[PDB]
């Protein structure tokens, strides 16, 4: 149940005070919680990041970060209707397609692309054929791992084709949802990292509140495809910046 006590608050405070002064982690500005679940969660790791909805703290607005958008084959429909809409006309730093993306960016161009952007968002029909195009730098770890979006609010039936349109209000709504919420990727073992909060865009009670939000959404029973994956007793929590130790919370 409820996880906000003096142990959690002291650990998170001491982590911020350590990362302000320590000359070994003055570049990574992030807090992750490591959930040590009881059992091994069974579902294998596809690289599709499911979305954990925070309830009362937008941790990122879609305009304070670089967004790369990856589209389908002809890309003219998505590029024009996204760039001359003025609901979405300034939201994407880049809009490209998979064919000319893998044509242009080969080798160290991918390292420059990694350092250039910080939100990779793909059309869901091309999201699966990305781990060869974007290489393994985007899939080792998870900080620039691409998100699925549906571009049209239209569903495919059998024996008939998806009519090719796109909806800029709908795609702004789901990028707003993506930047407003946090995310996780399931795996086989009992370790699971979830990003919660930033180093100066956030503070201790809101980081603690969204920590408890991710806990509730994860060990929930309903919301079962997207969130109900912790089937057993969640055993431990830790907080860490990417080069910082695992400050423990809630040892059950």
């Amino acid at each position: 149940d409820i996880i906000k006590s003096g142990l959690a608050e002291k650990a998170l405070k001491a982590l911020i005070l350590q990362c302000e002064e320590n000359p070994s982690l003055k570049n990574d500005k992030d807090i992750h919680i490591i959930i040590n679940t009881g059992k091994k969660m069974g579902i294998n790791r596809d690289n599709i990041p499911r979305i954990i909805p925070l309830t009362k703290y937008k941790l990122f607005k879609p305009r304070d970060l670089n967004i790369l958008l990856i589209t389908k084959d002809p890309s003219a429909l998505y590029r024009e209707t996204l760039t001359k809409d003025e609901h979405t006309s300034e939201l994407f730093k880049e809009i490209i397609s998979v064919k000319n993306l893998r044509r242009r960016f080969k080798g160290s161009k991918l390292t420059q692309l990694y350092k250039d952007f910080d939100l990779v968002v793909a059309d869901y029909r091309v999201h699966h054929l990305l781990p060869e195009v974007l290489g393994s730098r985007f899939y080792h770890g998870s900080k620039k791992l691409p998100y699925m979006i549906r571009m049209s609010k239209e569903v495919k039936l059998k024996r008939q084709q998806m009519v090719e349109k796109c909806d800029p209000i709908y795609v702004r709504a789901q990028l707003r949802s993506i930047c407003k919420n946090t995310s996780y990727i399931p795996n086989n073992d009992n370790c699971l990292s979830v990003r919660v909060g930033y180093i100066q865009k956030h503070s201790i009670p809101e980081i603690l509140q969204n920590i408890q939000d991710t806990i509730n959404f994860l060990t929930d029973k309903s919301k079962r495809p997207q969130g109900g994956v912790i089937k057993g007793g969640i055993i431990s929590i830790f907080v860490k910046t990417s080069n910082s130790t695992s400050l423990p919370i809630y040892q059950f």
């Binding site: 002291k10 650990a11 001491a14 350590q18 910082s244 130790t245 695992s246 423990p248």
Partner: peptide, 17 residues
């Protein structure tokens, strides 16, 4: 100080094992 407490804790846990 709690930072150094817990990193010494995991260090001496591994040393004890």
């Amino acid at each position: 100080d709690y930072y150094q407490q817990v990193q010494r804790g995991k260090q001496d846990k591994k040393i004890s094992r």
